[PDB]
Amino acid sequence: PQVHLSILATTDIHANMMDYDYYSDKETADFGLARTAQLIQKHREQNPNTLLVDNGDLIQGNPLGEYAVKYQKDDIISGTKTHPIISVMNALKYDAGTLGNHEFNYGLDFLDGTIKGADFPIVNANVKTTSGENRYTPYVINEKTLIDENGNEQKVKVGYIGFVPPQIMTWDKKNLEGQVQVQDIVESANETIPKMKAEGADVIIALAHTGIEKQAQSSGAENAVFDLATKTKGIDAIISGHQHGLFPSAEYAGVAQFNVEKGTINGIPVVMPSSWGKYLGVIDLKLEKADGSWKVADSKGSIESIAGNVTSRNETVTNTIQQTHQNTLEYVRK
């Protein structure tokens, strides 16, 4: 009897809550989480066993992100106020998030404070203190009661692990030098996966804030998804970002280890849903239990555009962010 599990994913939102360009000071139809959330609802309606994750580069990039750090830094840091972007994610009932490089742009304290307000775990395994301790929650495992194809309950332990590029040491040198170090993405995965398996994880989802190259690279690579898929063992699904590209896409047809039709790399489903909420990532897993152990019998990775599928703003996003958005308009209009 199988379990059909769906994972929905956003990446590189870059603080675009509304379908709005603060620079031209105009509405747009082309991007924004208020539009992507319409796809999220649609997919949730299709499968009760649905998880929702974000892949980082979330809280920074436009004037709304600037507004939050300028006007609410102290209260966000203390946990008094929830970061307004995190409030949206909370309203949407995200199950997990992770850190992109741009999460570090406003300093470590603001990031810690941002994380404090999330209802869901925000994980990262490769950023460490100067003495070698995990600087963030490295992974989490949640026991989920999923419904199988016979309608029966199946308890399945789902784990999330996250990765950021080591190049944050360059990009955010001022904020980070002397305060953290960053372990190679693949080496972090290999160190951490065994622990997740020991602690009972049945399905492991990588929130890999890192892109895709067509061939192997060595340690320290900025865009390491191919290496994650080939050099590790135990990851069942990979969410990709950072490059602001699309995966799957036709360009990868004929590249060793890639299956464009299935959206897989080395047999593991991978999705990279563009940037700014222009696409939603969708991974389907068919889980099969044997010998008390779960495996992935079949999978697919796909992406869906908001273009042509979405024509209006999601009310949950709009209602949640509205005040902050109007505050941002005032801030921008000086």
Next chain:
Amino acid sequence: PQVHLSILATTDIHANMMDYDYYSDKETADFGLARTAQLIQKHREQNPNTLLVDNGDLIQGNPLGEYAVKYQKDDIISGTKTHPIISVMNALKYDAGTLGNHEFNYGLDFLDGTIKGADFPIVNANVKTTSGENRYTPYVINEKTLIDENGNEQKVKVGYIGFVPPQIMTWDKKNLEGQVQVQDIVESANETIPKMKAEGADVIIALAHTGIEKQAQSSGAENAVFDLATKTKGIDAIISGHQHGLFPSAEYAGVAQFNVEKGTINGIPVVMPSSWGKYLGVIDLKLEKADGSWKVADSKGSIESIAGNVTSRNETVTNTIQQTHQNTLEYVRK
């Protein structure tokens, strides 16, 4: 009897030649000089006395700009090959251009090489050598034979002067420290304008790669257009950019010195046509001659969107850039 002179302006194109997103690897209708050039053609058909200028942040920003610096650096530097973006500008018969902050991202030598290939002058008055000499052509004056409203010829000397924000010393510290310095925008204008008037300039156009604030600022300001308009004398038209905003726009109604209906600041027409070719700036001057000297009798600044006015790519742009664009696709796809 008057002369109607029209000035068309682009700004912050950021190497978007085609209406194409290299990151998602697909066509867009949203931006690109190939679309803006359709507005250029339309406006040129409306008035024989038309000038065309670019306001900087032109050669950098996307993978096409990267392709040029990576694959053609040596030949661009020597002047052996024209920068492909500059070939497009040459083909569209631009009359002048200027330096935005991003022109410095690839170093001083590459920028010098890029400029060598332009058929038109690229001016900048405020970047200086460490000893105080102008690092670039500070201004140019061209005697134009314009046609007045009686159909008669009128020789009018048009000058172009350009400015970049002094903050390039921070943004491009590695490329610039110890090699140039940057004079305050207003102070550069006040130093340079008298010389232009001495050399006979009748009409002076500022290619001001700098944005707009609603009230006065002091020396060293990043966004200095208000101060240019109020603290200098002798500028007849200002092209603004850098902020990626819109001007004229309704937000400025009721702000002292601003006239939204006419698109002026302190009586001088100003335009800021968004970014990436999403708008074309259009300034109309009605020039009158009294006693051997020209003055601007009436003026207007306006911007026009490619949205709703343009539905296809301009052939001169496409034909000129096609090979480079195809090479860029190969580069991006690896």
